[PDB]
Short mmCIF file of N, CA, C and O in Angstrom, two decimals:
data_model
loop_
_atom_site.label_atom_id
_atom_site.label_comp_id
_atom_site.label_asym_id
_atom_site.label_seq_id
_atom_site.Cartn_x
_atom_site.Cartn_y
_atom_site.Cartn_z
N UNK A 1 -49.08 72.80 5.09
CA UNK A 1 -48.23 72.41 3.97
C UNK A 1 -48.12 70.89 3.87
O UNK A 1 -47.72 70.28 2.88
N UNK A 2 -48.60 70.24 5.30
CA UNK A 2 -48.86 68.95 5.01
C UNK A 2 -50.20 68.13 4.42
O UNK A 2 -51.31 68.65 4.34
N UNK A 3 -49.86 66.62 3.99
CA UNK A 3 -50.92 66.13 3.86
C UNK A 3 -52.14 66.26 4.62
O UNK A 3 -51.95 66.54 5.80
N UNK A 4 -53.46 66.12 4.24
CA UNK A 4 -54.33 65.58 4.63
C UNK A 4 -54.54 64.52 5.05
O UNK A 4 -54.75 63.69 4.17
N UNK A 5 -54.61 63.83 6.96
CA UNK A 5 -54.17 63.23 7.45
C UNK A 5 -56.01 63.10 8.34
O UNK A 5 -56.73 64.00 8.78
N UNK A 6 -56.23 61.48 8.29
CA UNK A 6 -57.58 61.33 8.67
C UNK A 6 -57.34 59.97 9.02
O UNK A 6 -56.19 59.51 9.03
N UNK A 7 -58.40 59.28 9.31
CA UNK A 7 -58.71 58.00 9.90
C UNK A 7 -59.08 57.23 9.02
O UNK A 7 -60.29 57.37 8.88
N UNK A 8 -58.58 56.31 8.19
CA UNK A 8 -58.91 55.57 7.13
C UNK A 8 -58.50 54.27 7.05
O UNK A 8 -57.50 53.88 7.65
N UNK A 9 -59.31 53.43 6.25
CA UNK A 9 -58.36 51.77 6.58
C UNK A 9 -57.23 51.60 5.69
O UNK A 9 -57.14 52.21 4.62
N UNK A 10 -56.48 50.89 6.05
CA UNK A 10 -55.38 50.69 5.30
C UNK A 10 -54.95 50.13 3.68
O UNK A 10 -55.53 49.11 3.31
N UNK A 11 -54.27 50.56 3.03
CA UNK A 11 -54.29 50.52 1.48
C UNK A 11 -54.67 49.10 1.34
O UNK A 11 -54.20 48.28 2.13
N UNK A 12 -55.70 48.65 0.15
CA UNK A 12 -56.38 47.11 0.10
C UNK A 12 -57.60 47.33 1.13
O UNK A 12 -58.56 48.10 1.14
N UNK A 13 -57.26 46.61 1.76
CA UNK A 13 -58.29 46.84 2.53
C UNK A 13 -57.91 46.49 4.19
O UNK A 13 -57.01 47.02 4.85
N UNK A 14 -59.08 45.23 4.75
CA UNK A 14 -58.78 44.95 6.11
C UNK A 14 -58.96 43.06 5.58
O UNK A 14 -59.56 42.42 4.71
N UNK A 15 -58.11 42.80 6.63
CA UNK A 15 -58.78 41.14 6.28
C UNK A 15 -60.28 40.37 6.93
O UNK A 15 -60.77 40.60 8.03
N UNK A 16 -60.85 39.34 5.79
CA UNK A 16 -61.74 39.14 6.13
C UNK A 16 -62.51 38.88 7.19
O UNK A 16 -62.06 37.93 7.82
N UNK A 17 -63.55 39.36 7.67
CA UNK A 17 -64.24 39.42 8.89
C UNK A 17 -65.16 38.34 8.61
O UNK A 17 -65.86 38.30 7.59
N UNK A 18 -65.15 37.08 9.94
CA UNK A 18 -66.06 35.99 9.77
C UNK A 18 -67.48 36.53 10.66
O UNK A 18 -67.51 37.24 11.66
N UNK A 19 -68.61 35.90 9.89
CA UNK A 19 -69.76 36.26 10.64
C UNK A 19 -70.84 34.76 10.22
O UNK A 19 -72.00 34.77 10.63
N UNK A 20 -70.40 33.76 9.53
CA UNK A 20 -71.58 32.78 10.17
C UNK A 20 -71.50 32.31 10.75
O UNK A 20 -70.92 32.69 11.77
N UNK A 21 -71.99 31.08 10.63
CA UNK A 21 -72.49 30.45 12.13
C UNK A 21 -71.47 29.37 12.00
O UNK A 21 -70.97 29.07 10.91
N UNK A 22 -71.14 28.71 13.31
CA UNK A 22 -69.74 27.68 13.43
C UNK A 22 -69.96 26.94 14.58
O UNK A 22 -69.50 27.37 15.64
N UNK A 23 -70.77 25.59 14.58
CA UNK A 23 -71.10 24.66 15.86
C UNK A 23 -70.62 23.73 15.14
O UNK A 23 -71.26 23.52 14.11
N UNK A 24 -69.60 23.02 15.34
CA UNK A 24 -69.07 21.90 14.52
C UNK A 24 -70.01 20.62 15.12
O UNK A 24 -70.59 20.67 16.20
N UNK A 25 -70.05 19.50 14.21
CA UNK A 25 -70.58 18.52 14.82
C UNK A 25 -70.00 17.80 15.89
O UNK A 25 -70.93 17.57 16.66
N UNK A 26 -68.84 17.26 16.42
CA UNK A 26 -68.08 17.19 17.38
C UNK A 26 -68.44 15.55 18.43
O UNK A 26 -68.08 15.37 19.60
N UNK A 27 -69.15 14.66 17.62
CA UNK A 27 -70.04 13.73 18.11
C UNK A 27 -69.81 12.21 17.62
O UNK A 27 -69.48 12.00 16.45
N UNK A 28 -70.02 10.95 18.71
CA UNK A 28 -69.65 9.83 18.33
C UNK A 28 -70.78 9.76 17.66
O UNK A 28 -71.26 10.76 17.13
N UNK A 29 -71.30 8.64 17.60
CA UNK A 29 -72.29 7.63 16.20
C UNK A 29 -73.03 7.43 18.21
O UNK A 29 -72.62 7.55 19.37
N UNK A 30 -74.33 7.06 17.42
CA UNK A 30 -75.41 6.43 18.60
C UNK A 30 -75.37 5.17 18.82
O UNK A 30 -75.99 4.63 19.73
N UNK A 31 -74.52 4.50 17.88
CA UNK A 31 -74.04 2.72 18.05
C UNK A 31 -73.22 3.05 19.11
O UNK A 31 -73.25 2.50 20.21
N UNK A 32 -72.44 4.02 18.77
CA UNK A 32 -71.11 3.99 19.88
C UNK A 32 -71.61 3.57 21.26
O UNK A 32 -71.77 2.51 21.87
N UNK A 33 -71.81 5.10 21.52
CA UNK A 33 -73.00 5.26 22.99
C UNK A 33 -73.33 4.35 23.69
O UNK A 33 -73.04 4.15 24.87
N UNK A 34 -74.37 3.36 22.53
CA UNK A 34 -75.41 2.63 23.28
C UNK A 34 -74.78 1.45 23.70
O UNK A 34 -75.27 0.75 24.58
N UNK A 35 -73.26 1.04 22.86
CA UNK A 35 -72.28 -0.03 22.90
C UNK A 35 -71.99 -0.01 24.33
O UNK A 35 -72.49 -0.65 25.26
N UNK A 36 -70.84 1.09 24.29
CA UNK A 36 -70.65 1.48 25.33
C UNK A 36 -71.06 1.69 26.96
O UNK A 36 -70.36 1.80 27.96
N UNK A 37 -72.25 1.68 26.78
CA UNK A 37 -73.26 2.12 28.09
C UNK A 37 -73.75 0.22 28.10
O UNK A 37 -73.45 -0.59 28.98
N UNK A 38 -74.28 0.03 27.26
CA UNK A 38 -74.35 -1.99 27.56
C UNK A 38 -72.96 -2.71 27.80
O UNK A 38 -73.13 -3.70 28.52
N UNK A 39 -72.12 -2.60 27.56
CA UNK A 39 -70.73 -3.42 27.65
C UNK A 39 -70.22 -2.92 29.46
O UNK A 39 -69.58 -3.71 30.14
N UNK A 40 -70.57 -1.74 29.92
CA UNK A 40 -70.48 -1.56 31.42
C UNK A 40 -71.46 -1.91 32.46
O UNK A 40 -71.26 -1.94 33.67
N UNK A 41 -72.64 -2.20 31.76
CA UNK A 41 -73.68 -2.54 32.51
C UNK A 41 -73.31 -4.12 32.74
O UNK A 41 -73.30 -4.57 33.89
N UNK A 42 -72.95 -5.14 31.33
CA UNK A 42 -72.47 -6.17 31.48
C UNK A 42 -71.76 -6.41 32.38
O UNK A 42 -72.03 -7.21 33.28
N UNK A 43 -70.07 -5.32 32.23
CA UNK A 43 -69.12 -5.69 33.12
C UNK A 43 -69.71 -5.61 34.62
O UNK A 43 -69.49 -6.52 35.41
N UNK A 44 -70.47 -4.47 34.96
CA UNK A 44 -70.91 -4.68 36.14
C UNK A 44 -71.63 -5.54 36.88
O UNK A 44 -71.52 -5.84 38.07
N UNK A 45 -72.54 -6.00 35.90
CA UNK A 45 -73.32 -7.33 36.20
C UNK A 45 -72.73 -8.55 37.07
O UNK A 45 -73.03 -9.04 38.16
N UNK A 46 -71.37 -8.92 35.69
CA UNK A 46 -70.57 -9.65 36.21
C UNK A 46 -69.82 -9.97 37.38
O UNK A 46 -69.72 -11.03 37.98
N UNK A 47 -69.16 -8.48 37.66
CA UNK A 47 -68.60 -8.39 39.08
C UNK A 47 -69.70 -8.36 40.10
O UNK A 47 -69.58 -9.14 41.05
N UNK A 48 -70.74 -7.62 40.06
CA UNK A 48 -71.90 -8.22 41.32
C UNK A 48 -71.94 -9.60 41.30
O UNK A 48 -71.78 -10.05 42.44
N UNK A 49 -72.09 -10.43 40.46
CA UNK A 49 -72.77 -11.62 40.61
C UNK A 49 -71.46 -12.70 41.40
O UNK A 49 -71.54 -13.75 42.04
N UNK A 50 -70.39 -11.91 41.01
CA UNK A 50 -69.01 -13.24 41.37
C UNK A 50 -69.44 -12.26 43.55
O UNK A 50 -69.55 -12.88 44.61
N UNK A 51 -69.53 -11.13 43.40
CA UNK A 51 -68.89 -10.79 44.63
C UNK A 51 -70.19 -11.27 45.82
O UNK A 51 -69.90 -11.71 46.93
N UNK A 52 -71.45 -11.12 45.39
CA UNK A 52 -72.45 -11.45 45.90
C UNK A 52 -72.89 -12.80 46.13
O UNK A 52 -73.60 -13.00 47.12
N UNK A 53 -72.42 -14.28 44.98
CA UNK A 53 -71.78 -15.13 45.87
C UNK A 53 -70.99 -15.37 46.67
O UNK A 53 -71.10 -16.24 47.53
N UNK A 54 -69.99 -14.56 46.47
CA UNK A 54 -69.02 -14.83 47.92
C UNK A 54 -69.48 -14.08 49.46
O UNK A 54 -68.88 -14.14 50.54
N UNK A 55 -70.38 -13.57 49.23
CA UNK A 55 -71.16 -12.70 50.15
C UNK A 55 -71.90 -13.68 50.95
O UNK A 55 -71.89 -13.81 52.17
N UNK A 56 -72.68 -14.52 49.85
CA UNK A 56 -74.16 -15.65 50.43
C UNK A 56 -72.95 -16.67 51.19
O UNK A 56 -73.05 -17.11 52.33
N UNK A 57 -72.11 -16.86 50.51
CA UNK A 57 -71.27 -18.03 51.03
C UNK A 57 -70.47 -17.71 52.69
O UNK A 57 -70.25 -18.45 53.65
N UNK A 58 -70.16 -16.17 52.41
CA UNK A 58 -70.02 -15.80 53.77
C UNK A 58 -70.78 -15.61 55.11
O UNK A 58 -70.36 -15.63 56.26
N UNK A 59 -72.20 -15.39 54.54
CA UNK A 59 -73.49 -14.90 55.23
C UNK A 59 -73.24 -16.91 55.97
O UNK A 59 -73.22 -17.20 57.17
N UNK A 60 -73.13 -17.71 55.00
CA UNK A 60 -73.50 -19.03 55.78
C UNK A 60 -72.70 -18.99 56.25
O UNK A 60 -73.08 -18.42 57.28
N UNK A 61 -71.73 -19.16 56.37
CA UNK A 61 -70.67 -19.37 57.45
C UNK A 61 -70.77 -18.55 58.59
O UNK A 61 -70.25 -19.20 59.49
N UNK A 62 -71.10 -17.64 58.96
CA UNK A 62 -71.31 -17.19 60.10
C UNK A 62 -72.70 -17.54 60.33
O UNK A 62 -72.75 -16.88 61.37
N UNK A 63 -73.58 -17.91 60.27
CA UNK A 63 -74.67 -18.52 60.60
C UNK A 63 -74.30 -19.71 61.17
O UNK A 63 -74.59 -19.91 62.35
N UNK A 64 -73.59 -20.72 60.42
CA UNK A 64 -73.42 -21.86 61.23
C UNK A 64 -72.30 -21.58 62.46
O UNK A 64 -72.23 -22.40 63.37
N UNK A 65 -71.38 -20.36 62.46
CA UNK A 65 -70.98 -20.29 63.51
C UNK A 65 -71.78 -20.19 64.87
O UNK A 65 -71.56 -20.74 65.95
N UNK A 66 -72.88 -19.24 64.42
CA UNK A 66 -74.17 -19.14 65.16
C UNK A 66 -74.87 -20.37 65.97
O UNK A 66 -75.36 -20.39 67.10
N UNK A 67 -74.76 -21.26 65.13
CA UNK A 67 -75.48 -22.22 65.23
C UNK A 67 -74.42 -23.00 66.15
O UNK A 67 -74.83 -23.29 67.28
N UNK A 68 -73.16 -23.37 65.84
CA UNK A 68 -72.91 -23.74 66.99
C UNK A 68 -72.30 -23.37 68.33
O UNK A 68 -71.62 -23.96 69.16
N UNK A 69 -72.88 -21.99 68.21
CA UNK A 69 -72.27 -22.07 69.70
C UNK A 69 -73.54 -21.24 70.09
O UNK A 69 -73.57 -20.17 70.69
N UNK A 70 -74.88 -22.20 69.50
CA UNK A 70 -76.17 -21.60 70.13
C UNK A 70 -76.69 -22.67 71.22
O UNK A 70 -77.57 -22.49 72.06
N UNK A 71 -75.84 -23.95 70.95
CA UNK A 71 -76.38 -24.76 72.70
C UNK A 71 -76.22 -23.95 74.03
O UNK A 71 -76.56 -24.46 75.10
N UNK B 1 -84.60 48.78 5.88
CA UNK B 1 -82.78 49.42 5.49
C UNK B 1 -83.19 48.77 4.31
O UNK B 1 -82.48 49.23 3.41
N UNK B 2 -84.09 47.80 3.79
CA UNK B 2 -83.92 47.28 2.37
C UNK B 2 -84.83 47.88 1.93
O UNK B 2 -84.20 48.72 1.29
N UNK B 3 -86.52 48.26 1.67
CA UNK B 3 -87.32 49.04 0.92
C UNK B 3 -87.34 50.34 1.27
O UNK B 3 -87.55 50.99 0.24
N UNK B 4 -87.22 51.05 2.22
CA UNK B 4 -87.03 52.32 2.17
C UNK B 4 -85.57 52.95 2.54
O UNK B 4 -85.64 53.42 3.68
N UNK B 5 -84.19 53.13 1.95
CA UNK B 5 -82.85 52.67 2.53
C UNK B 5 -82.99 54.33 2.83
O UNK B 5 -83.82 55.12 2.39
N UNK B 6 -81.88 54.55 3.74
CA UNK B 6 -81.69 56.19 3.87
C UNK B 6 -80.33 55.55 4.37
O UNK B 6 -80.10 54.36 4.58
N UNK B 7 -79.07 57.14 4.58
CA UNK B 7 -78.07 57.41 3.71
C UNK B 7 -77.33 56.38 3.20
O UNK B 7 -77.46 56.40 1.98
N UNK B 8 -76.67 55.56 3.54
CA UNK B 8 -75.82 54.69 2.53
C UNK B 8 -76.16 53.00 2.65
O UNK B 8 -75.45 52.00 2.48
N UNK B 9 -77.45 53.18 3.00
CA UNK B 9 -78.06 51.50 3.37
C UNK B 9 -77.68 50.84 2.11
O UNK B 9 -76.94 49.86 2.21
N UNK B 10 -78.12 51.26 0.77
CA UNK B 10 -78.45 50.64 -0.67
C UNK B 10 -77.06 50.52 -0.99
O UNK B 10 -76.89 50.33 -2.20
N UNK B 11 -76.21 50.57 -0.45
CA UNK B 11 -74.75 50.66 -0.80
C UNK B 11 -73.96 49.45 0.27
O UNK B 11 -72.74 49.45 0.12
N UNK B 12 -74.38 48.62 1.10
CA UNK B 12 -74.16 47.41 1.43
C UNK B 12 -75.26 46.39 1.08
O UNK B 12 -76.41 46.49 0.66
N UNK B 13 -74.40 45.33 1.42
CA UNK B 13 -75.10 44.02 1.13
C UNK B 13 -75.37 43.22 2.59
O UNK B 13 -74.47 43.37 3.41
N UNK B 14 -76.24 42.59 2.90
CA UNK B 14 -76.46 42.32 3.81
C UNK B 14 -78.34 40.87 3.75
O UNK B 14 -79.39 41.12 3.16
N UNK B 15 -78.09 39.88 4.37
CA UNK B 15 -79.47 39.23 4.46
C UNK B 15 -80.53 39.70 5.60
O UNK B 15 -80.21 40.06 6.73
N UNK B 16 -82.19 39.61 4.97
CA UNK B 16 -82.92 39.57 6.20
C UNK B 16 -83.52 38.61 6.50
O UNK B 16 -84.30 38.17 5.65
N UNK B 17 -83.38 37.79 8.02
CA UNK B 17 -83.64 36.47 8.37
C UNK B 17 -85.13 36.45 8.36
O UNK B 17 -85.66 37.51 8.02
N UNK B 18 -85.88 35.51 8.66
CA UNK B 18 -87.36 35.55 8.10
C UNK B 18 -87.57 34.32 8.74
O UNK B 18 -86.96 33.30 8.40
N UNK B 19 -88.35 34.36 9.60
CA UNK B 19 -88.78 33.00 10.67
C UNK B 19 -90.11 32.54 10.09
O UNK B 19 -90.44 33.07 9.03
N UNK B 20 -90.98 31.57 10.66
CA UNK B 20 -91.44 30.86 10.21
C UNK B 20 -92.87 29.86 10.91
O UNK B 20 -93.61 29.08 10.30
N UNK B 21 -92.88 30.25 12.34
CA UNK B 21 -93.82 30.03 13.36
C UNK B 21 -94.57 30.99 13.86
O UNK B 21 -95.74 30.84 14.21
N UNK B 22 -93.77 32.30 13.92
CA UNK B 22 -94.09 33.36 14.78
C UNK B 22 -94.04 33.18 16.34
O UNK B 22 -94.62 34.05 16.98
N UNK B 23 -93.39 32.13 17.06
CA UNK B 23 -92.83 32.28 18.17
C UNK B 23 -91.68 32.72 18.37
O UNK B 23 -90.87 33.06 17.50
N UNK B 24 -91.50 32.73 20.02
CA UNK B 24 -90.53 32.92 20.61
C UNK B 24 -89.46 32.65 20.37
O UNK B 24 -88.72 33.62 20.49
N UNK B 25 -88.75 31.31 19.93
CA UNK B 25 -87.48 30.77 19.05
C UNK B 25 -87.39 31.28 17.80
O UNK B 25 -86.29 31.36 17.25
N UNK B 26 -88.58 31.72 17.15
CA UNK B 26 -87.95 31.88 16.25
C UNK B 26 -88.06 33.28 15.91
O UNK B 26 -88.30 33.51 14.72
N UNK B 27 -87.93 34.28 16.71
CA UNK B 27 -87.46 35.25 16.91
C UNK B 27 -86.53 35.48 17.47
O UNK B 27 -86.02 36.53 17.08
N UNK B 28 -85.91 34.91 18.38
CA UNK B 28 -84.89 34.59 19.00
C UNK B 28 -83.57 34.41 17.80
O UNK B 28 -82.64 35.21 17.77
N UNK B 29 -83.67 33.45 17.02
CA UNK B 29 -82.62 33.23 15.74
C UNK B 29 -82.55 34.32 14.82
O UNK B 29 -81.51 34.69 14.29
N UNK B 30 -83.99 34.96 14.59
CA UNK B 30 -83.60 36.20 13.85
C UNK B 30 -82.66 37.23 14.48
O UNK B 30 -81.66 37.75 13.98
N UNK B 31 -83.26 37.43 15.82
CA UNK B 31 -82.08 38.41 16.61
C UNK B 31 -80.35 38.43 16.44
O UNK B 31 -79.57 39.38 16.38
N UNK B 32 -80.07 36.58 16.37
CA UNK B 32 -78.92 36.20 16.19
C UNK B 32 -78.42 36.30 14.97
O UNK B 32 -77.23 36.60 14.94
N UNK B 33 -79.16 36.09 13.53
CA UNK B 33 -78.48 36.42 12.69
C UNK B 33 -78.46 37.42 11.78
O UNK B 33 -77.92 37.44 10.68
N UNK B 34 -79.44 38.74 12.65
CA UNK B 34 -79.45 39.77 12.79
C UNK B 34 -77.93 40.72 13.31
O UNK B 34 -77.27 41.66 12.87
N UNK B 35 -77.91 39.86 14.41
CA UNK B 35 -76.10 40.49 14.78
C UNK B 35 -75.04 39.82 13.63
O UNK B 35 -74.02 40.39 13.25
N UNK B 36 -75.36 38.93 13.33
CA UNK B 36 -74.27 38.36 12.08
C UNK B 36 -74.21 38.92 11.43
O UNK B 36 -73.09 39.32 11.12
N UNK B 37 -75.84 39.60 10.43
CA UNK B 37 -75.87 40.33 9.23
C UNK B 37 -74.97 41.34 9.70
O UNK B 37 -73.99 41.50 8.97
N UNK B 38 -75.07 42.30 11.08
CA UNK B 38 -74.53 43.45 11.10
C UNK B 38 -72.99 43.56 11.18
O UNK B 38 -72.41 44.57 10.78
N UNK B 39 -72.28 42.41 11.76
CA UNK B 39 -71.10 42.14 11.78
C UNK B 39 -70.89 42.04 10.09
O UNK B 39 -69.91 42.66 9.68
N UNK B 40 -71.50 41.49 9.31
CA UNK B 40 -71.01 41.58 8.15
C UNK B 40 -71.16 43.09 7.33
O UNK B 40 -70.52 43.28 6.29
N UNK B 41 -72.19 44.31 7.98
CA UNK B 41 -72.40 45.09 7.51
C UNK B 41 -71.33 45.69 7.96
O UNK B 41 -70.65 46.26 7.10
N UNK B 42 -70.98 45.73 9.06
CA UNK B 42 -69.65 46.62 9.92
C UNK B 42 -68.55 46.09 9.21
O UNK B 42 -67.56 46.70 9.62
N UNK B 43 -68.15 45.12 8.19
CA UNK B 43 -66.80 44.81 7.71
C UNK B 43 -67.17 45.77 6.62
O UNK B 43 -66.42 46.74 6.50
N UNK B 44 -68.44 45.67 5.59
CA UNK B 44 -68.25 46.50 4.97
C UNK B 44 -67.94 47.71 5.00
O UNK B 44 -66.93 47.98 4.34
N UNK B 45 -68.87 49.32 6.00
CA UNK B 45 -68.25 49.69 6.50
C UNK B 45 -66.80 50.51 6.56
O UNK B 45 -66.31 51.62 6.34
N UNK B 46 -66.51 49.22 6.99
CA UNK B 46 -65.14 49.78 7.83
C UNK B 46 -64.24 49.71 6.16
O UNK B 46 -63.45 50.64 6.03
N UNK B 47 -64.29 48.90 5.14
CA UNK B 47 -63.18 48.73 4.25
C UNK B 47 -64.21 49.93 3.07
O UNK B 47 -63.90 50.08 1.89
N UNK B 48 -65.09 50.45 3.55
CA UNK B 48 -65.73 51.66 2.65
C UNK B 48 -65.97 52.81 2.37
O UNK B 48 -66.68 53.40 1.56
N UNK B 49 -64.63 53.26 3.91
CA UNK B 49 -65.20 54.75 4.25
C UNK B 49 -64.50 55.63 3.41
O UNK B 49 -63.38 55.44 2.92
N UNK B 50 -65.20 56.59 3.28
CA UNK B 50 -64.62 57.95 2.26
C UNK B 50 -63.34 58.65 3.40
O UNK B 50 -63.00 58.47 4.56
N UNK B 51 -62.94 59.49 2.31
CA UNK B 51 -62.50 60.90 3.37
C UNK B 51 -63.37 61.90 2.81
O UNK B 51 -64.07 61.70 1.82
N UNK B 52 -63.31 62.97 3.47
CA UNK B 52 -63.78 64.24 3.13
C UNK B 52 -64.63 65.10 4.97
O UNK B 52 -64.63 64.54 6.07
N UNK B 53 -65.09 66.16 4.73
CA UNK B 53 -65.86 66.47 5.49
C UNK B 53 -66.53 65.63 6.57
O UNK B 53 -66.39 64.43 6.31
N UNK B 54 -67.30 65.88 7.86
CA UNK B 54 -68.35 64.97 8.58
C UNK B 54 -69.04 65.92 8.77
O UNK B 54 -70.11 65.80 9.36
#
């Protein structure tokens, strides 16, 4: 005496189902990058070159300590 | 499912991907938007079904 009662989607319908494709671009510029990657190579440059004189300057000084107390 | 359809093929919409080398990649992408097409066939589907009998 009751309805006819089945498996059906709901009145309207269902909401939309996505199916293409979605890789956003997500990316700096190649100026950026290449900026970037030279401006650390610089900075590093820099700091070798200050620390590696103070290195040569140290290397002499213990050499001439060497030196004198090589009589 | 598009030139010879049997039971309710001709009654969705759906693309067939179509590569272009005949390799490996690019069979590979058809596979993939092969599952897309069908995800879009399964929405249809699902918002198309009758009642009656099975």
């Amino acid at each position: 005496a009751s309805k006819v009662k089945q498996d059906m989607p709901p009145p309207g319908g269902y909401g939309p189902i996505d199916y293409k494709r979605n890789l956003p671009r997500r990316g700096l510029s190649g100026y950026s990058m290449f900026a970037v990657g030279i401006g650390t190579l610089l900075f590093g440059y820099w700091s070798m070159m200050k620390w590696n004189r103070e290195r040569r300057r140290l290397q002499i000084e213990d050499f001439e300590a060497r030196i004198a107390l090589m009589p | 499912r598009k030139t010879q359809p049997y039971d309710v093929y001709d009654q969705v919409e759906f693309d067939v991907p179509i590569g272009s080398r005949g390799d490996c990649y690019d069979r590979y992408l058809c596979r993939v938007e092969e599952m897309r097409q069908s995800l879009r066939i399964i929405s249809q589907c699902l918002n198309k079904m009758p009642p009656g009998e099975i």
